[PDB]
């Protein structure tokens, strides 16, 4: 597995439901690659951002971003993944509790094997 997610740091927690999500992603890359990493943030449903990283840097690297919150117009009233060349290889889920509180101490990391 050439790229591995080293960690995710939620940077504004807790925050307003209307505030944007500020994340810091740390990843490692063992050797150079030809295609792009695509990072998606998703509210499970609306996509809040899709960041693109290519050429992939070798070694340990970090990036921050600010993704915009979801729209309550689409949400019923009562109610992060990465891919290489379109092949999702890691996915992290969080629980979220208007003040939002992201339960950032219990991430749920799911890894898939792909061909790079």
């Amino acid at each position, epitope marked *: 597995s050439i790229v591995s997610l080293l960690g995710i740091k939620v940077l504004n927690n807790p925050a307003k439901f209307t505030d944007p999500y*500020e994340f810091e992603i740390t990843f490692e890359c063992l050797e150079s690659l030809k*295609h792009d990493l695509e990072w998606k943030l998703t509210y499970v449903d609306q996509e809040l951002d899709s960041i693109l990283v*290519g*050429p992939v840097p070798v070694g340990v*690297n970090k990036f*921050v*971003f*600010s993704a915009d919150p979801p729209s309550a117009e689409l949400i019923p009233a009562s109610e992060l993944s990465c891919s290489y060349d379109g092949r999702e290889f890691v996915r992290v889920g969080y629980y979220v509790n208007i003040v939002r509180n992201i339960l950032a101490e219990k991430p749920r990391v799911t890894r898939f094997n792909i061909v790079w």
Partner: antibody
Amino acid sequence: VQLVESGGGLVQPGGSLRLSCAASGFNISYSSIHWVRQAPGKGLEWVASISSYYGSTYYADSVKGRFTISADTSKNTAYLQMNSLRAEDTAVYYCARSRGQASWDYWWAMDYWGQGTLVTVSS
Amino acid sequence: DIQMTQSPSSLSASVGDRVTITCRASQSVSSAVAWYQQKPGKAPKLLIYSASSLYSGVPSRFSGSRSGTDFTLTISSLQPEDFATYYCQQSSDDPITFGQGTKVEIKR
């Protein structure tokens, strides 16, 4: 979102000048700030960038040593301190912004620009 | 240092034509490539980001595509407001570099 440059003007070769870019509508801690310049009748040339979250700075070779880019996150403002100026630095200097910050030399597209501020270096 | 060789430097077209502007990168820049429009006395405006994504609020007649180190900006139906400079840009590596520009002038 808005970017407002100020500090342009006229100086002599070897003189100093400091541009400033006041940002509003976004936090500069999660966007990269750029300076792009355009000499009279020429194209755009990248000057410098700052990733204020990581404090990392990058310079075009023609200005390295002479220019210093910096940022104040509490004032949401970036600065381009231009020292040892040369006649070929005469240009309109634009402030620009790209979303996200990387810990390495890599940026997303510049989606907002200032209106530009003229800098003339001459005897 | 990666060079963005833009062509043509100047082209002459009518309203309603299709315009293709190309940019060749001297190395692989993946898709960290953007297209900007500039009119005289005004700041550049972003048109295409990440080589092929159309920026919010840009008329759909603009489009960009990638094929290796060859990047292509296409205007499907030239409008009166569209005559300006277009610059390509790579931001995959230090330094950020621009193409030399394409002035689209009206034919008469």
